[PDB]
Amino acid sequence: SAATILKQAIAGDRSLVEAAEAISQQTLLRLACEVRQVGDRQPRFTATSIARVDVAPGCRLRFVLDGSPEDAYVTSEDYFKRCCGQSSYRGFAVAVLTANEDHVHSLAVPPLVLLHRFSLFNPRDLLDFELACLLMYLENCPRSHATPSTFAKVLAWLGVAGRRTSPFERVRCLFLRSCHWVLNTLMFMVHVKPFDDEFVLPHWYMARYLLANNPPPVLSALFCCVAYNPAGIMGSCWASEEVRAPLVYWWLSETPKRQTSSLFYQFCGSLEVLFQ
Amino acid sequence: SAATILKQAIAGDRSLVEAAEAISQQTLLRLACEVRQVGDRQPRFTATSIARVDVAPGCRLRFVLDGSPEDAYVTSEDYFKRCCGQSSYRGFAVAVLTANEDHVHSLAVPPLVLLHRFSLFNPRDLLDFELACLLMYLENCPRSHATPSTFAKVLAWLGVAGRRTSPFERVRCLFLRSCHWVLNTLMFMVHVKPFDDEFVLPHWYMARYLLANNPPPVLSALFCCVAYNPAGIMGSCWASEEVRAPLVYWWLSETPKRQTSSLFYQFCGSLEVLFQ
Amino acid sequence: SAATILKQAIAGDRSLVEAAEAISQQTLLRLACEVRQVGDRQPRFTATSIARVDVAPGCRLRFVLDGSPEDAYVTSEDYFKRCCGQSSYRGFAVAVLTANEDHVHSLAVPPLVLLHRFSLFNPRDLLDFELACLLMYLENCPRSHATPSTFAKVLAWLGVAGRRTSPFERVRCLFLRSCHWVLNTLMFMVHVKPFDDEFVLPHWYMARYLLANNPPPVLSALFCCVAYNPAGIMGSCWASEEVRAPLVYWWLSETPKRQTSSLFYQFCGSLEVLFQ
Amino acid sequence: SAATILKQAIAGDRSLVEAAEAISQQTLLRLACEVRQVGDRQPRFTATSIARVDVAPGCRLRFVLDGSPEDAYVTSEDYFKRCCGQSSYRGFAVAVLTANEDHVHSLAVPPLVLLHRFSLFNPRDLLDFELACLLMYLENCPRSHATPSTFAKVLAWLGVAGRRTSPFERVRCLFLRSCHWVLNTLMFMVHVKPFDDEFVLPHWYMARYLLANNPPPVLSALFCCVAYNPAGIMGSCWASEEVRAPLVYWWLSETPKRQTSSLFYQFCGSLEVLFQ
Amino acid sequence: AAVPPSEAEPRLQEALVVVNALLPAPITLDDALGSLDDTRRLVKARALARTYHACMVNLERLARHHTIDGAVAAHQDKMRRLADTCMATILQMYMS
Amino acid sequence: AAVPPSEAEPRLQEALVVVNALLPAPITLDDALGSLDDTRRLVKARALARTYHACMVNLERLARHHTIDGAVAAHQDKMRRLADTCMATILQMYMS
Amino acid sequence: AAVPPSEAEPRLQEALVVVNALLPAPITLDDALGSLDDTRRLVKARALARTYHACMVNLERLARHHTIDGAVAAHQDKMRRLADTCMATILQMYMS
Amino acid sequence: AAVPPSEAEPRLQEALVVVNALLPAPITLDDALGSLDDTRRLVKARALARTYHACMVNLERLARHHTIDGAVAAHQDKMRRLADTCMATILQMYMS
Ligand SMILES: [Cl-]
Ligand SMILES: [Cl-]
Ligand SMILES: [Cl-]
Ligand SMILES: [Cl-]
């Protein structure tokens, strides 16, 4: 596989940093949801918590929560404090995928394999919380809110968040590119020119054309306690029982959970080499 | 041990890649079986699920399942979907061994050591599922199906599967060579010239001659909820209680299980070295 | 991040050893307490066990335990033996932080993140036990014992302990610098010139001035079974429920606990490299 | 610490291999015992199983088991098969130490630290089983069997076992040197010249002289379901409750028990390095 | 066999090392390279999905704007055949 | 494709290696570098906390030691404004 | 004792690294090398198993095709002794 | 800022690596070096334990083989003082 990276770097005249970035850019997080559980009772997976997103004058995120009046915004900071103060709140569940695995109405990941793709995210600060909140919002965003104004505000905020983030902050970068994949695919699905067509999920690009109107079964066949928005344009993978049953089974398992903040192995230390 | 590899590479005039391949080729998977468990009830280990194997015109595997009519084939894809859709289905259990450990009617691995050789395989795609299915079939194949026609079809399919696989796909390679060991030993045991006599399990080569007819006890002594084919030529290791009790005990243990897809440690990442 | 170390080493003309030490010096242990649990009953976390500390002629630590007469000292060795002989004694719980996270009346670490910062310390020898005892004493030390005499004795003992310690004894070094952070901050909080003002916790330096008398809410907002000294000058982080509930929840969890003595990964062994 | 190895290699004019061997030779296994447990009932730790040891004409070990007639020997192979066939048999428990930690009537390892020194050994073959049996025998050997004849037979067998073993068989080497430490210390304790006085445990060398007859308390103070031989010369560490309670607690609390065969981390594989 | 330091002096080299995984666990390098290859093939396949869509729009235009006159039917047959060809090529790429 | 040893002889290099983490788990290099940066900014900010404290002491001195005479009120206004300026700068650093 | 960068400038080297285990866990290099050695000895031992088999076929031929005539008994003794020799050599290799 | 391969061609180096821990887990290099140092100090201290033992044997010989004659008492005092000196030195090494 290193010989493949070398061949790709030379063939495209891309530095090794650029060649590695093209490979890592194929990964994203999907199925973002808040986990709530009272003791050992039945857990709840909610992806509908944020109904609307807006950007404050000082480029800070503000939200309209599910069930709240249309123009009753809460700062992302106040929502972060409220969640941290809830004893039932366990963080966000997310599934790690490669772009080729998202097949629009299904995931090309068998349910027993998907079990091993989930991780639990406990936001370390406000920016982490905002990124998880934004990913979840974008995946569940209905047609009514998928507008040029929303797209412009989201991109501007992602631009500011991106400038604050270094490529060595691997988890923040993962959430940031996941937002870019979901955002650009959402724009494409509502027949709006994406900001970056390289960030339209590849099977979604095909599905918009192939499933447009009364598709033949042969084309539809290529694509096929959990609260998600049924009108969410980017959330159609949630409909699959082969997606929801592994999420619940992953949660219920007594085996310790992988932490999203630990997805990227790191070592920093001294190396001493002794030889004759 | 690295000095041993160096000595072997020079002595045989084999490149380091060839010397390493000769060492890794000594490893194989055995005791392939499907695991089914309803909640926390008694588990079931089935190695008899596939009664017959045939290759389709487009070199895809098709199976006659146990209990189904003689010529009632199911595609490997339909059997993969059926298993993925079964809530009781847990994947395949396999035991990792070196070729010198398979002693025909026993394994030269103490039961408490064998406990640590099992891993659970959750096929990542169709090819993975077909490989596990084929290994399990070959181990349980009776005399009636151990024919030149079956041998030719199996080799042709393995050839196509092999060309699709790179040596960096460690797990696929492991299942592929396991099929070659079981296939060539099976051919040898039915007195048919193997395709590759280097792939006849070494103790099986000795046992066919030494245990041919009314062997003396001194020669027999060298070799000695689980459904397996009692008429399976390559499945004689299954008869041993020192093989079946560790499989069941391994499954019931509350300690997390090793995933077959994780048998080969991998790291890919950046290395930065700072020195004065 | 290695390019950042290189830039810092050059810009400050600090060797790589000095540049790495400046980075590692930002880490410390806080919330030191003794853990006692009789079987599976309610655990007890005690940070008040040591009322007074004194240095013996041969520079060995002596303690006046809580509830004992004012001048009734026990040797650190006798207290180590007593704890080792108590069946309910489980060692010391400590939380690992960076200096920027200690916000005086709170920790800038969300409760679900703090859960992953605790480790259990089982002193390997007397010096280890003395260091954990001293850290806990300093964090809970009231105004009455925060005197120049106590400061001089503590610094002299830390100097002797420091000379006995190598920078490769990572855990001992961690406890030693944690004592220096808590000691120098304590001196600063009682309006006594610290021995090293670089070891005054940075938010504590700000809080002493900003919260001096009737602070405005806007300034107070920047800072906000468990027995701790409520009169302990350096123990104000203990008052927060977002500190104590994670400690108890971390303890009660069935997931195996991280050992403080294992915080720093180590490998020592042979490396053989074979190539053509 | 690598600078220490370099200084030691140069100062003693010892190769790096010799310098590393002197360091690793300080480690040994102690407290060897067989573990038996019927389901989840009370476990049994037995170090008394082998009453006598003898070497067969073909230099194979034979044993007189506890409770069997004085001259009723069983081959090591027959005892290995009997143990492998017992469903209650769990293998051998052993504690890893450095030579300076064995203080004759106590171990200089606190009970909560000792908990983390135990590992479970499941002999991989006959030689592994014989080594564990021999270590356990030597630790529990009474005065009556600590004779020149026994010493000669044990050394001759260890010599043959040593010639069969390479230094990269880390676990076999660990059991072999543990036998040499226990054997040479045993000879010294019965006032017989050891084969190698460098293999007399250092605190035992001091204790034989200092505790010879009516020792003063000040000298005695330097040294202080489990079946062990109370007349076992090398087994005096077993008398301590600070040794036995951690063994039992480790058996009932340590969820993923460390395997003695995995004590020495190993990696073998390909390394690819890409750079500009 | 051992060469003493007096004959071959040992060397000690020291460094600070920083190691970071490229990909989030449990994603392997093979997984991400396979995804990059699939994505590049699917980006090329956009031409086929666009062509299929143009055929389907032409079929809708023919049905909305409109016997012994076979002209409309001849146009519909041409669009149906080209869409079938696009569909066949897409299916071959998906079902390899 | 393989090059045999007879054409390109393999080399074997051996060493003793010692590896030690710089930081206690789960603290990352980014966490400790971020802390070093925050600490350096907060060490510089000590000047602001000291200046605010000076204003507050001056306000206490003015209130303790003491109408158509606006002198004391003019001094109090100056100290209140400078303390507000220090407070605003500290808040901007904390709430970025 | 520390050498500042101004006297010995630090160097930073960067690479992308790919590491892959050769063998499936928990199989060790010693296990696989021991298996390769056993297999090579057992491949050589095929000659002994084949010779033993030839003796046994000759014994069957002698018993099927057939006293003061000791010819058959003399042939059977020769085949029994050679098979015993083969058997003894195989047992020595297995039971070392 | 990125340098393309056309300006600085990448290099790929490949090797087979074998890594083995020197010590059994959880024993650290510091633990084993500390043990080697303690053992070397205790091997030197054998002289003190042997001297103490000689004083104790001399005391037994004096008591077994035997007033205004203080000769035996003078010998016992000398042996008791030397044993005390040995004991004091051993205790200082143990209780540092
Ligand atoms: Cl990050
Ligand atoms: Cl693979
Ligand atoms: Cl340490
Ligand atoms: Cl070994």
Numbering used by the authors:
A (entry chain E), B (entry chain F), C (entry chain G), D (entry chain H): 11 to 234, 253 to 304
E (entry chain A), F (entry chain C), G (entry chain B), H (entry chain D): 24 to 89, 96 to 125
Article sentences:
We characterized the pUL7:pUL51 complex by solution scattering and solved the atomic-resolution structure of the proteolysis-resistant core of this complex using X-ray crystallography. pUL7 comprises a single globular domain that binds one molecule of pUL51 via a hydrophobic surface, a second molecule of pUL51 being recruited to the solution complex via the N-terminal region of pUL51. While the fold of pUL7 is not similar to any known structure, the α-helical pUL51 protein shares unanticipated structural similarity to components of the ESCRT-III membrane-remodeling machinery. Given the conservation of the pUL7:pUL51 interaction, the conserved localization of this complex to trans-Golgi membranes, and the established evidence supporting roles for pUL7 or pUL51 homologues in virus assembly, we propose that pUL7 and pUL51 form a complex that is conserved across herpesviruses and functions to promote virus assembly by stimulating cytoplasmic envelopment of nascent virions.
The pUL7:pUL51(8–142) complex was crystallized and its structure was solved by four-wavelength anomalous dispersion analysis of a mercury acetate derivative. Strikingly, the molecules of pUL7 and pUL51 in the structure were arranged as a hetero-octamer, with single β-strands from each pUL7 and pUL51 molecule in the asymmetric unit forming a central β-barrel. Closer inspection revealed that the pUL7 strands in this β-barrel comprised the C-terminal amino acids encoded by the restriction site and from the human rhinovirus 3C protease recognition sequence that remained following proteolytic removal of the GST purification tag. We therefore suspected that this hetero-octameric pUL7:pUL51 arrangement was an artefact of crystallization. Taken together, these results suggest that pUL7 and pUL51 residues 41–142 assemble to form a heterodimeric ‘core’ complex and that recruitment of the additional pUL51 molecule in the native heterotrimeric complex is mediated by the N-terminal region (residues 8–40) of pUL51. Structure-based searches of the Protein Data Bank did not reveal any other domains with a similar fold, which we will henceforth refer to as the Conserved UL7(Seven) Tegument Assembly/Release Domain (CUSTARD) fold. pUL51 comprises a hydrophobic loop region followed by a helix-turn-helix.
